[PDB]
RNA sequence: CACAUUCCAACCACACCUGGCGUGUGGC
């Protein structure tokens, strides 16, 4: 029996199945131990059990295989793995494992793994002959990501603006600078829809840290991807745990020659969690910030790169400004000269209800010559020269108003002449 | 000592839940309790300890009234014309100064008063903040599902309560799941958790439709009635004031898709979108459908309706405990 | 495939600091 099958089931179907099995009232307790108990029963009377998830190594040597629907949380759903696997197949933190499991025997409460069927959607034999992550040779953005769908709906134009404001490719680092109440949420939503529609081949992951549960719920069932998130009713331990697990999963997946693109919103809340979870090293900055509290966020942001040997990792993290604290400014200043794809969203345009509010003049992309052709980049330069002397609001006014009538971006370039 | 008072008022844990003037009044009440514990008699004292910078300068209340009981706080109206009191209540004068606001018992009672005051603060703050979401559905994991009620974490030190009477034997609970509802009553003058959320009220489902059904909310349709026997039957009666929409055809979705979704959200309760009419006769005819009724009678002096059913559809007329009728009478 | 060292409902497990003493050398 597969675990992900009972995973994609709602709680009501689990309740109905447990009542069909004729047991103690299972609807009373957690979905976690609901699945645990129904699995224990169906495995008392049932086949080999099958399961899948992502592995995290403990300091005891053993490992835990956890689910992304539980956002990689500790509980009875986890699969225990022995260090003997981590010696035989030499398992690693963040490996996508899928294999056979069994009930725990006398005194045990965690399902034990039997035989690894797929390691990162790949062969264990081929799991040995792999390349290390930092041992790779990074490179600039080589292949551009097509965000324009070509239909021109009410929201698709938003993505089109990006296609002429800051082109993104596999291996690029994107950083969004926006104050609160600027419309970045559905900005990432439309971006994710477009990159999932245009490229169903690259595995797409999003990250929500200290976000409201409403957006988490509406996102985890609207776009494609293992939509993993971290709500604010948990301490910084869980947030940094999601950070570790998904960043290691992306690292292993690009090591397996796959293009991974990670959507984070926001990087400032994650860095604040990093600060409040890391022990104090004596050196305080302005606003209660540790110098070592930015080391791991810098690692998380710089993990993205464009591999020469194969695969790529592109990160798009959003940053908050203009919200008053000391940490927001110190973090945004520390991260300004890090990413090579700035996207500035000025609230001065969002206050006029002109969406998307994009600061085209203060935005840009370095090494953008390796993403578009000569005439495409030339048209981009000419339009930037045309719109730069204009202000902010009127700039986006002209951009959106002229992209409203024409429907393909190259046609917009043509008509702009 | 004033420096320590300023350090305390500046280094409070919750600067947002415990405002500055609230710290001032809390320190004043603590020093009042301290001065009360100081003297053997019972004399109430106000402090007004130099809110911004300076130290304390206590006072002495006297409660102008012709009585004499507890003369420490007694001043007769006739023997009050000196000092230019000239009033009948509010003789809070400065007869008493030189208080000690730091010693052992005073510090302990001040810590206790501060704990009580920050608790009251947190309570009032969370209540009057999350009370704005009274008509709309609230979310949040549960703190603890006790016997007489259950308490739910709504967020940052945010708590709500759902009573036991509004629960169901089949509705099922343990710390860690999130159960929603409608905040139906708020008693900010209570002694503890005072954010009362229910789930058996009818308008709940109405509010639920306002999240899912796009026809409701723009007034183009009108959700009028909702008969809810929780766990038994949850029927809804809507009306359309326009002339281009159907009451039951649009709100049902696509062959039991949205109504089934909100039913599973409500706990898989049987939901049937009924169509009420302008008269109670057709209303109770539709509420007990699909079935026939041999007699529909209305009585005003008895405040009742006689519904006599024919034989041939009993399996859809009564059901469990007269549920198909129990909603109508409800 | 294989060793397997598990995130640990009442509650057994989380109990205590201190004195006078000692080393070495010398004496018959």
From Swiss-Prot, chain A:
Q: Name the GO terms of the biological process aspect.
A: DNA-templated transcription termination
Enzyme class, spelled out: hydrolase
Residues the record marks as site: RNA-binding 2: 326
Pfam families reported for this sequence: ATP-synt_ab (PF00006), Rho_N (PF07498), Rho_RNA_bind (PF07497)
Question: Could you give a GO molecular-function term held by this entry?
Answer: ATP hydrolysis activity
Any idea of its EC number?
3.6.4.-
Cite the residue spans of the region called RNA-binding 1: 61-66, 78-80, 108-110
* All copies of domain Rho RNA-BD, residue ranges: 48-123
What outcome is documented for mutating residue 202 to G/S in this protein?
Answer: Does not affect the kinetics of ATP hydrolysis and inhibition by bicyclomycin
Subunit-level organization: Homohexamer. The homohexamer assembles into an open ring structure.
Family per UniProt? Belongs to the Rho family.
What does its UniProt record remark on the domains? Answer: Each subunit has two RNA-binding sites, one at the surface of the hexameric ring, and one at the center of the open ring structure, where RNA helicase activity is thought to take place.
Name under which the protein is recorded: Transcription termination factor Rho
Q: What is the lineage of its organism?
A: Bacteria, Pseudomonadati, Pseudomonadota, Gammaproteobacteria, Enterobacterales
Point out the gene that encodes the protein: rho
């Amino acid at each position: 029996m597969n675990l992900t099958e009972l995973k994609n089931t709602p709680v009501s179907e689990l309740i109905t199945l447990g009542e069909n099995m004729g047991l103690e009232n299972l609807a009373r307790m957690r979905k976690q131990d609901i699945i645990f108990a129904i699995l224990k029963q169906h495995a008392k009377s049932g086949e080999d059990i099958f399961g899948d998830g992502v592995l995290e190594i403990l300091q005891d040597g053993f490992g835990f295989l956890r689910s992304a629907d539980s956002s990689y949380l500790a509980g009875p759903d986890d699969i225990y793995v022995s260090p003997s696997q981590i010696r035989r197949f030499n398992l690693r933190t963040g490996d996508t494992i899928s294999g056979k499991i069994r009930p725990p025997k006398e005194g045990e409460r965690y399902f034990a793994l039997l035989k690894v069927n797929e390691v990162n959607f790949d062969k264990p034999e081929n799991a040995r002959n792999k390349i290390l992550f930092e041992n790779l040779t990074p490179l600039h953005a080589n292949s551009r990501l097509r965000m324009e769908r070509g239909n021109g709906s009410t929201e698709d134009l938003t993505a089109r603006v990006l296609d002429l404001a800051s082109p993104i490719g596999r291996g690029q680092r994107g950083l969004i600078v926006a104050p609160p109440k600027a419309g970045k949420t559905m900005l990432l939503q439309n971006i994710a829809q477009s990159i999932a529609y245009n490229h169903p081949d690259c595995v797409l992951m999003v990250l929500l840290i200290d976000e409201r549960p409403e957006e988490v719920t509406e996102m985890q069932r609207l776009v494609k991807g293992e939509v993993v998130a971290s709500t604010f009713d948990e301490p910084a331990s869980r947030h940094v745990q999601v950070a570790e697990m998904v960043i290691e999963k992306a690292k292993r997946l690009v090591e397996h020659k796959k293009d991974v693109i990670i959507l984070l919103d926001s990087i400032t809340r994650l860095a604040r969690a990093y600060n409040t979870v890391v022990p104090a090293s004596g050196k305080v900055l302005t606003g209660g910030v540790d110098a070592n509290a930015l080391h791991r966020p810098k690692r998380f942001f710089g993990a993205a790169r464009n591999v020469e040997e194969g695969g790529s990792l592109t990160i798009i993290a959003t940053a908050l400004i203009d919200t008053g604290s000391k940490m927001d400014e110190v973090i945004y200043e520390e991260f300004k000269g890090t990413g090579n794809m700035e996207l500035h969203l000025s609230r001065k345009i969002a206050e006029k209800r002109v969406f998307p509010a994009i600061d085209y003049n203060r935005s840009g992309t370095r090494k953008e010559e390796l993403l578009t052709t000569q005439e495409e980049l030339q048209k981009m330069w000419i339009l930037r020269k045309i719109i730069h002397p204009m202000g902010e609001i009127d700039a986006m006014e002209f951009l959106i108003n002229k992209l409203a009538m024409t429907k393909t971006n190259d046609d917009f370039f043509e008509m702009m002449k | 000592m004033n420096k320590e008072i300023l350090a305390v008022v500046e280094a409070v844990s919750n600067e947002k839940a415990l405002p500055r003037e609230k710290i001032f009044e809390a320190l004043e009440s603590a020093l009042a309790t301290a001065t009360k514990k100081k003297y053997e008699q019972e004399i109430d004292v106000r402090v007004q300890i130099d809110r911004k910078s300076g130290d304390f300068d206590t006072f002495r209340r006297w409660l102008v009234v012709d009585e004499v009981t507890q003369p420490t706080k007694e001043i007769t109206l006739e023997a009050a014309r000196y000092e230019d009191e000239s009033l009948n209540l509010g003789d809070y004068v400065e007869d008493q100064i030189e208080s000690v606001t730091f010693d052992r018992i005073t510090t302990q009672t001040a810590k206790q008063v501060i704990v009580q005051k920050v608790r009251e603060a947190e309570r009032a703050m969370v209540v009057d903040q999350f009370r704005e979401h009274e008509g709309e559905i609230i979310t949040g994991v549960v703190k603890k599902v006790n016997r007489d009620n259950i308490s739910l974490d709504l967020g940052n030190n945010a708590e709500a309560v759902i009573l036991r009477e509004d629960m169901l034997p089949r509705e099922n609970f343990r710390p860690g799941d999130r159960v929603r509802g409608v905040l139906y009553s708020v008693r900010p003058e209570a002694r503890g958790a005072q954010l009362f959320v229910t789930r058996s009220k009818p308008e709940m489902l109405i509010e639920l439709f306002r999240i899912e059904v796009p026809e409701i909310g723009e007034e183009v349709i009108e959700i009028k009635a909702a008969a809810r026997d929780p766990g038994s039957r949850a029927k809804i009666a809507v009306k359309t004031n326009d002339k281009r929409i159907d009451p039951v055809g649009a709100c049902v979705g696509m062959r039991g898709a949205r109504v089934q979704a909100v039913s599973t959200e409500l706990g898989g309760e049987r939901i049937d979108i009924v169509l009420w009419d302008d008269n109670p006769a057709q209303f109770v005819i539709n509420a007990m459908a699909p079935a026939d009724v041999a007699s529909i009678v209305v009585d005003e002096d008895k405040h009742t309706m006689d519904i006599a059913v024919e034989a041939g559809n009993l399996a859809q007329a009564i059901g469990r405990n007269g549920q198909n009728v129990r909603l109508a009478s409800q």
